[PDB]
Design a protein around this ligand. Sequence first.
Ligand SMILES: Nc1ncnc2c1ncn2[C@@H]1O[C@H](COP(=O)(O)OP(=O)(O)O)[C@@H](O)[C@H]1O
Ligand SMILES: Nc1ncnc2c1ncn2[C@@H]1O[C@H](COP(=O)(O)OP(=O)(O)O)[C@@H](O)[C@H]1O
Ligand SMILES: Nc1ncnc2c1ncn2[C@@H]1O[C@H](COP(=O)(O)OP(=O)(O)O)[C@@H](O)[C@H]1O
Ligand SMILES: Nc1ncnc2c1ncn2[C@@H]1O[C@H](COP(=O)(O)OP(=O)(O)O)[C@@H](O)[C@H]1O
Ligand SMILES: [Mg+2]
Ligand SMILES: [Mg+2]
Ligand SMILES: [Mg+2]
Ligand SMILES: [Mg+2]
Lengths: 49, 441, 439, 443, 433
Amino acid sequence: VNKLRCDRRPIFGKNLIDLLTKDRRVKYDKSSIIDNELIKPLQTRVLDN
Amino acid sequence: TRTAAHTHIKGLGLDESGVAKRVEGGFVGQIEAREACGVIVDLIKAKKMSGRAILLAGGPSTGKTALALAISQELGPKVPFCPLVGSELYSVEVKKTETLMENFRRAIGLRIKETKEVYEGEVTELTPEDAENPLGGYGKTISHVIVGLKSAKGTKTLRLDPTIYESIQREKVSIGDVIYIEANTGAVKRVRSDAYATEFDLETEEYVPLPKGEVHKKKEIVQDVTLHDLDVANARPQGGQDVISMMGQLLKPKKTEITEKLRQEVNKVVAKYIDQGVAELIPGVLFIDEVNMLDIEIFTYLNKALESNIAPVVVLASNRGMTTVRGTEDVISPHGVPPDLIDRLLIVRTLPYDKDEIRTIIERRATVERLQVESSALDLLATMGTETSLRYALQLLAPCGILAQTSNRKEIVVNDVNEAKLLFLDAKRSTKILETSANYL
Amino acid sequence: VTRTAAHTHIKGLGLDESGVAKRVEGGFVGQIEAREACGVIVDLIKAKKMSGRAILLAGGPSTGKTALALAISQELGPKVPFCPLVGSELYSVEVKKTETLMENFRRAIGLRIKETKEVYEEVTELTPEENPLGGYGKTISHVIVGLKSAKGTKTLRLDPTIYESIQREKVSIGDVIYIEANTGAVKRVGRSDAYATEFDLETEEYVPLPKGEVHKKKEIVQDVTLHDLDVANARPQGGQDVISMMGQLLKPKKTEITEKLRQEVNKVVAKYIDQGVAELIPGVLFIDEVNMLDIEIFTYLNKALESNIAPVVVLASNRGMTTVRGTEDVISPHGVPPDLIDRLLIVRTLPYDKDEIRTIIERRATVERLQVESSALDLLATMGTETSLRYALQLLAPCGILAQTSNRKEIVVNDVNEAKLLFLDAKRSTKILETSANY
Amino acid sequence: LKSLSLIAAHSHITGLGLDENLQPRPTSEGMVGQLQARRAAGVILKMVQNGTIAGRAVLVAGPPSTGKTALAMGVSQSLGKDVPFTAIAGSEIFSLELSKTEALTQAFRKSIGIKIKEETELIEGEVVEIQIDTGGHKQGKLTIKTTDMETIYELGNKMIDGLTKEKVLAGDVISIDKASGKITKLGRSFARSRDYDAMGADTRFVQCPEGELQKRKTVVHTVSLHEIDVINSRTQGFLALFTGDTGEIRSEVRDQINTKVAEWKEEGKAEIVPGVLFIDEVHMLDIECFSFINRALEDEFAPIVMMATNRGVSKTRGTNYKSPHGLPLDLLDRSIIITTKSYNEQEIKTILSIRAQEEEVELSSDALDLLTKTGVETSLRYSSNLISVAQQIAMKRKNNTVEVEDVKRAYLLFLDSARSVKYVQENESQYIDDQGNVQISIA
Amino acid sequence: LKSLSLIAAHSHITGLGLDENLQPRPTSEGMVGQLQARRAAGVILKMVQNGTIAGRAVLVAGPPSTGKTALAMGVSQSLGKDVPFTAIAGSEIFSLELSKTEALTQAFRKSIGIKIKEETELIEGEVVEIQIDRSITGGHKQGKLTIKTTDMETIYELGNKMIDGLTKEKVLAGDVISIDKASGKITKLGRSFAFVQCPEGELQKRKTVVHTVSLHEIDVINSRTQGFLALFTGDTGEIRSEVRDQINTKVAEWKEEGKAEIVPGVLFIDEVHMLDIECFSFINRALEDEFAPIVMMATNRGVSKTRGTNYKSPHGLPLDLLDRSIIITTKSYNEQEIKTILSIRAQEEEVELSSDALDLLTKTGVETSLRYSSNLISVAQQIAMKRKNNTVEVEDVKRAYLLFLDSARSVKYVQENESQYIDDQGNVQISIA
Ligand SMILES: Nc1ncnc2c1ncn2[C@@H]1O[C@H](COP(=O)(O)OP(=O)(O)O)[C@@H](O)[C@H]1O
Ligand SMILES: Nc1ncnc2c1ncn2[C@@H]1O[C@H](COP(=O)(O)OP(=O)(O)O)[C@@H](O)[C@H]1O
Ligand SMILES: Nc1ncnc2c1ncn2[C@@H]1O[C@H](COP(=O)(O)OP(=O)(O)O)[C@@H](O)[C@H]1O
Ligand SMILES: Nc1ncnc2c1ncn2[C@@H]1O[C@H](COP(=O)(O)OP(=O)(O)O)[C@@H](O)[C@H]1O
Ligand SMILES: [Mg+2]
Ligand SMILES: [Mg+2]
Ligand SMILES: [Mg+2]
Ligand SMILES: [Mg+2]
């Protein structure tokens, strides 16, 4: 069980979740008030047509 | 502070009435080309024409790309500016025509600027106001909701339409933590606070400080988007657990040839919005260097594309003489550009340099690289540039500085440049070595 | 009732202890120098020191190059990997040829790993479970399970998680299961055989009871290749959500495996090797008709060979001074660019002679279980020396069929003549092709 | 021996053999001769280590088997780790999923890395023995113990709502951040090892952490620009860092990443480490690739580009004309050329001795002299392989040292290129001709 | 109303400029000269507007900068909206995900419109009262409203989906609302008080709406369940033939019964000289279909080599396609015509020109190409504006002429400085000494 634990514990990730969350963060909080009409994702287009 | 073949170029060094100074903005010589590019810049800033094409031609190492970079710098970061090498249009995923159209549309920009009224602050208290029912009834009737807001230096209580109650109910507003409401559209957004942050032993709820200034706020927000972003956002889906989202996530969504209908819809809605004064159009610049690598099909499609009414201004760079156009074998044209397209654009010449101009160029480049050279080596460097090439002399500066620093010196001398000549060769001496050797060299 | 295909009459290099090649041993005849060189090469491969050595065999058609390579593979042994390929096999459609070449390059070196595991194996009884005394709405502290096995029974206590795993397996009380305490996974082997005839029918196979001690300590040794680890990391099979399994549903197409993944795999393998858990064993990559390779793959071979864990590559070619395919004005020997042949070693294969051809025909007849006459064998040898060595070996079988038809067990001269008249060779077909109007 | 190399083609080289005044020593660190090229490579190494110069094209030119790849490997080794060094060949550019320019851009982005720092605070050592009994699971308190600290923390509604999910057995070392994030399970104390007889697949026994409960740490990660682009391209792009199917990342992502990196560097949270992009056999590459490089070399985020070629006045791929080194004059203009010369007899002997020392082969004096003679008449790599072949020959003979007889046997057992060419010329009929005419029949 | 646009190359022309009996005026609607070509274009426009003849191919041939593209643009402008006009280039057919025949079929089908009329009921007015009752923890809600016009005033009570439909867009007592019974779609016409006049007339009304869609869109919709998305993402591959075969018959029955009406359009192919022989053969076969629009192809090549072959043919097209085509030829421009073209182009860009400057521009467009002077107009105006005088003089025109080179001067400079540039063999001389 000692060897099992010593093998199980070191399973570190090559790219940690913290690193990718830091890299994928957005520095701008809120903007784009009039953008629910210019964008119009086609999921809404399916209903509109 | 990293320098790479540029960053000593800051504008065209122009002047009022459009006359170029001999030495200004990191530029020496090339007066006529700089004046023509300034006229082009003025035409761009006019924002009236569409699809105007200029091609600037000349020999290698004559400042052909520097001129385009200078006009991009003069135009300012606000306007779009799309650089492109002629070999990038050949994409495995999509046909070259659609890639050209995508880069063509990416140069057109749109600025969205609008104002918003905000009541943001820390909730003091909130209470419904009971009132007589408008109709016959037996029960409490709320006609207003009183909400008090306190921020740095400001405090104010407001009476609001009771129907907004659900907005609080959905927002889990609580009392005294945060609040941030829009004025006219209604609804509420919950942005805890530092006032009670240390009060609890530990909590997984974020805290924000007291908002600064008066509770009532006028905010002007401006952003810029290229039309290509609008097209790609309209075409691409978004959302959560919908089947289309799973399909997109599981398929590695390579680029697709966006239909013309979506582009027309985007154009119509954008025109409607700019009719209301909330949006503005900003034509940009599409710079393509080494156009000799373009195929004849791309040239033919460019012929039609330049005649559209939403085309940007396209500038092209080439350094070829009488050459056969790629994709054919019997058409020989100037600059490797078919005559029909040549008839559609304006040529801008570009002349080589003189020895004194080369010396000034080398001195300026040495100054921008944090190096000290006296005339006794600067003259030798100028002679090297006139003998081998200008770019060779420009490249040889850094090894000379490193060699000087190795000998615990500060100033570049004749010995350092001679040693750099011995160590690093130019093209001519390399070819001479190749020809005189017969050992697969 | 054993099948044969142009081989299986060779089973080694026929070398003594000192490396001297006997004239007729291991199915080979002649080719003493080539056999000695190949034995030296296989000794170097067994030395397990070098990395990236390259051997190329040169000779005319039907001279023994492929036989030599197969003899090397047989001499090496089943454990050491031996990846054979044809030159045209690299031109894939799903992925670029360089990626396929690298994948086959990594498929050649192997790794033997070992791991020691404990296991428990008839279920007697099980009890699930204390007071919450906190935020536990439903508490199952521990589960007691008893197993019977054959060499005595035993009971034990185990975590709630393995109990939920058992419930996922949904085993009964009179069953035999397979629980591996390393991963905490239970596998239902099945019902108990002695619990049969409870009902007149039962779909599930009853399966006998496990033999020996219930608590088994054991060790396992497996041989894999670095390409297996690369594939496992590139396309993991784990996952329970919709996305993972639906990705498993799509066809597996080769991609461009990154260099970083290979570097990390190498680091992990080196770390495990330093502990003595596993050991690596380089193999051999064999390529036929390298003249089918173009200049791009030939150039990439220079970079691949000078790597750090490159295996031993053996190349075959029968061309002379030819243009390297992919370029139009590069005359090179064997259709291999000058730098590559500068990077490798050359082994020449000599053409056979009449007596060697006769002995080869006799050996093929013996390994094919056929009876021939001395005069018939002499005629066959003269025929082979007149047209080709392969022609007689191919023509041997129809002669046997014709002999069997007339209830005669021995190949004779008239059967050989009839086979000659019935079946033509390349020379006669060429001589009768142009002497006609219609092609 | 951290790497998995058994013995490389050139593994005896560990950096350039030069000194403080950049003068190359005659033989050190596995390099012999090539003093001028070594000095130029040392100057290049100083330039790249300086980090104030972007986008330089240096081209190493010389006849085959003169040390170009060896020189680049020495430069990479002397540069040390922590600095990216992307080594590729020309033939790898042509891909079936990405265009040539896209692959070149990805290589350029991989060539330069960034160090990004991150400051964080954690709480560790949650050996608790919780105390929760009003209504709705009131009494929100729990203890926290470690080697030097011990204290009781009250709880809020959201904290207990987070705690009930991912239940803590009140005896397991757990971690939690004050960033209003998620409490992370770490492990179990050693006191609960004997309790069961078969642990699960997610339970480990970690010792009690020592020190203080509220720890603050800075962590620095080294990430290439290409990795950032890949991560930000898709929803889960990090997997494409292993599978490799990135699929022609668009320019908007690249410019957004450029702005983000500029902001990070301005705020002091990150710093850029430039690297070196090395290209073996640059002679075989399309005119489109050179056309793209001509402009990609001028970017601010451009590494130092080293190229290797061994061709004379040859035809450039994708064209009809012949140019020196198989490169257009436009690209050759914006580069500096380091030329390697042929090798001397004494240098060949020293290289052979070094390579034999690397393989633990004991050569006789006459054996080494004969090997040097053969490597002078023929190529050097032929003798370099002959040393190992002769070592195997001698080992088969039960003799540690290699003698002249073993070397001669190896020479007559494996054929040099010239002898094979002569044999092919003398026996043209037996081999398949360029027109597919062969004479299989011996008579 | 006007869509996004700027000053394009052909923004000054609006229609062919004809008389009532197809007689072309010398200068009208932005078109100057080329009377024969204009009358032929008018005849083709009448052919298209009649809507009886199908699958006619007409070829416009002439030297560069003559007016064929302008002729096609004028035809499209005079045809007006609601009539499809699909303009493509010769190089757009080549694709990596669609075969040449498939792309040509899509281009052909994109230029035929189908219009379906339907009748919709509406109830429009100003909201007078609204009472709404939500049962908390209850699954049903009780609604009622009172809606009036200038003449009528009536109350209604609502079901289930009416309440939520009214609540997603906040409806108050000061609003003007229009309701479609069939779809239940909310439409806010404005708040009367608390800038729109109160709705008048009857409380309910009827109207007709036309849905117009291309035949290619109908084809795409029925190909696959997800094919609707391909209407925007443009990702549809090789629609099966039976789909088109069935859709043609279905459209035929719809037209015969009277539900819908079809409108043929025009397919314009610019730079048609470059196209594979496969595309030419496919066009030869597909021109004969009954559901084929009028095809207008433009070319400027002489006896040139047709792509995909090794022999030269007139106009770059095979004789097979030329046999079943009608050719309209365009001729060069007189000096007076060039002056008029320059004048109208300058008038379009709101640029004031001097008479002597206009004459010099005419001379330089006679010696060089016309497009050169047309382009020079704007840069001359920019120079004049930078000189602070809002009038283009001869000096500004000469400054622009010397600053911006011409093709002939550039060719002469290259020929006399050959060593400066890179030749066809890749040999260049960068060193001055
Ligand atoms: N007038 C100038 N002022 C400053 N730098 C110049 C000037 N002319 C040329 N250069 C230098 O020449 C280089 C530009 O070369 P360029 O002529 O653009 O090559 P190509 O024409 O092949 O694109 C730049 O590094 C720039 O420093
Ligand atoms: N020395 C040999 N002893 C026995 N059989 C041989 C010998 N040389 C060649 N052969 C036989 O000749 C047959 C064909 O030769 P092969 O190796 O296919 O020629 P190639 O080298 O052109 O591929 C093989 O089946 C092999 O068994
Ligand atoms: N100065 C040197 N020091 C050590 N080894 C060298 C040196 N020069 C060449 N070599 C040997 O030559 C080989 C490299 O040959 P190289 O010149 O790189 O071939 P190519 O020119 O085809 O790339 C290596 O195996 C190395 O052992
Ligand atoms: N009759 C005309 N009326 C107005 N403008 C014309 C006329 N003919 C040619 N042009 C102008 O000449 C330019 C060249 O267009 P055109 O000749 O139609 O295309 P192409 O050069 O492909 O033949 C256009 O910008 C157009 O405005
Ligand atoms: Mg340039
Ligand atoms: Mg073979
Ligand atoms: Mg090399
Ligand atoms: Mg036209």
